[PDB]
Amino acid sequence: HHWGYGKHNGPEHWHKDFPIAKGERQSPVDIDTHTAKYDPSLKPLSVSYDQATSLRILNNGHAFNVEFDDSQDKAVLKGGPLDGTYRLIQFHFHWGSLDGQGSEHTVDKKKYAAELHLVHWNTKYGDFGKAVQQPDGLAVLGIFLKVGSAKPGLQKVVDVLDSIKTKGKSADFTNFDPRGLLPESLDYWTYPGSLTTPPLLECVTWIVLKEPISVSSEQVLKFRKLNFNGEGEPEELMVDNWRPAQPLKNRQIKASFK
């Protein structure tokens, strides 16, 4: 009876195994655009993904992760609110059963169809596992997805999903360029938060881009053909794998723009 996104094991239950679920800096949050504070101390984001080395794509029963070689500074995030270098380890998405829901963060209470999370860890901590134990261990770049025109840089991801339909399946996924998932603008909001899944550790500097990317209906429909279940188990579509907005508490979200 492990955590997930059903009625019996979903977000409202997580606190029983992970009491930090009711902590002081949980994610995601609603971003009130009028109450976000423009912060002139914030720097432009530096996204350096030209040397990224994707390796594999995995259905882990919650989402699918596209994994990167994070043994060197090949794909790094710097600048913005950050004071170190953060290596890309994986990206994944959260999405809905319908286009009207799926994002984790919200903007003036609006839900997007999905949200991309590019997960990076602060190199001074040596490994991801050590970084998640630190208040500045991770930087997650969040990008909203809306349904409209196709995202050509997503299609390579979409097309491999049939090979990792069920929990525990992986497929080699080399030479994927994550630059093809970015919007035009790197304007962002930032705040201190948490992992949005168990163990819900309060280790993340969130950087949420203002400008969404557009994906096609057909692209997101392929996400919704994935399964939470393993092969040879009853089919449960992998949909609505998002945590809803959590209390802001003693935080003000900062804007890089205005």
Ligand SMILES: N=C(N)NC(=N)NCc1ccc(S(N)(=O)=O)cc1
């Ligand atoms: N490196 C990993 N595979 N990360 C992992 N253990 N899962 C940990 C993890 C990483 C990121 C997020 S999120 N949704 O806050 O971006 C949740 C959980």
Ligand SMILES: [Zn+2]
């Ligand atoms: Zn995520």
